[PDB]
């Protein structure tokens, strides 16, 4: 069982294994698990590495796929590696011919997303999803695709905002960061580190959401007694983006609740 996403188990069993004793923290967390289980009875534990944000998002997005999203169906997406790299030679600083491997990764993302969206049975989609998330080359090639998608989306927004056009506010704040002022700094100092030395900042969860066009609805358990107990990324997305629901004990770790 090479699974990077654990077989689902009852969510009250999980929390009760995880959180014992009556400290304020524990009780806060108990109340958060109670909140989730009102709508979701089971949880899938997501490998706690630096890819957690991406693993939890891609596994949910893909296991609930009933059709292929148009941004992925667009054949022009395959030609995007060449187009960006020819333009912005600086992209060769990518941390894993670079056209070719990035191209294989999108190709893989589409074939697998398309394989899944064609399945009738649940059992079938889940067997096939389980068998893609086994810590093997294919799994981490998918993150390479999602991350590349993220750079692209960040490049487009940077360009829109220099020409004065309408940009979601988060992208302002994404490039106001000392070490992410331009797409180059973003790749060298942030995107490259992702899955190797860190996960996604909250600002980059916006970015992840824009890249895969999925609204990310997160129970942030350590914010239970505040208005951010559920945080949605991005705050106000288009009405048509599918929704992935995640739980998180902190902003570096994310798991999947299961049912509703």
């Amino acid at each position: 069982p090479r699974l990077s996403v654990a077989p689902e188990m009852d969510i009250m069993d999980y929390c009760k294994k995880e959180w014992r004793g009556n400290t304020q923290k524990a009780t806060c967390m108990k109340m958060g698990y109670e909140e989730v289980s009102q709508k979701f009875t089971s949880i899938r534990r997501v490998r706690g590495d630096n890819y957690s944000a991406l693993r939890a998002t891609l596994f949910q997005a893909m296991s609930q796929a009933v059709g292929l999203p148009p941004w992925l169906q667009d054949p022009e997406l395959m030609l995007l590696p060449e187009k960006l790299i020819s333009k912005y030679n600086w992209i060769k600083q990518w941390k894993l011919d670079l056209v070719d491997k990035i191209k294989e990764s999108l190709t893989l993302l589409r074939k697998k997303w398309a394989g899944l969206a064609e399945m009738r049975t649940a059992e079938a989609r889940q067997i096939a999803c389980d068998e893609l998330f086994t810590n093997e080359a294919e799994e981490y090639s998918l993150y390479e695709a999602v991350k590349f998608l993220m750079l692209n989306r960040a490049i487009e927004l940077y360009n829109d905002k220099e020409k004065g056009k309408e940009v979601p506010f988060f992208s302002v704040l994404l490039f106001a960061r000392d070490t992410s002022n331009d797409p180059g700094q973003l790749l060298r100092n942030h995107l490259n580190q992702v899955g190797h030395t860190g996960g996604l900042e909250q600002v980059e969860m916006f970015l992840l959401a824009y890249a895969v066009r999925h609204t990310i609805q997160v129970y942030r358990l350590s914010k239970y007694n505040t208005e951010e107990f559920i945080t949605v990324y991005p705050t106000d997305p288009p009405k048509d983006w599918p929704v992935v629901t995640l739980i998180a004990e902190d902003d570096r770790h994310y798991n999947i609740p299961v049912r509703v």
Binding site: L173, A176, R177, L200, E201, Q202, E227, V232, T235, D251
Partner: protein, 75 residues
Amino acid sequence: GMQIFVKTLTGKTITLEVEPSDTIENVKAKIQDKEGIPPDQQRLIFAGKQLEDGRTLSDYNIQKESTLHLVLRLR
């Protein structure tokens, strides 16, 4: 001795009592007391720029009713 707003990504808004001679270090010190956020995880944004620790607030012409933006690092 005036006040400023400090907004965050999701839409929660923090109010702070402040003084112009407050270094940035001091503003970050007040955010943690109010909101429990370590100062080494904070980035404060005003008018599109990142504010630098040992500068004051009267260095960025930050006025009463000024709205800054918090952009957080991962721990």
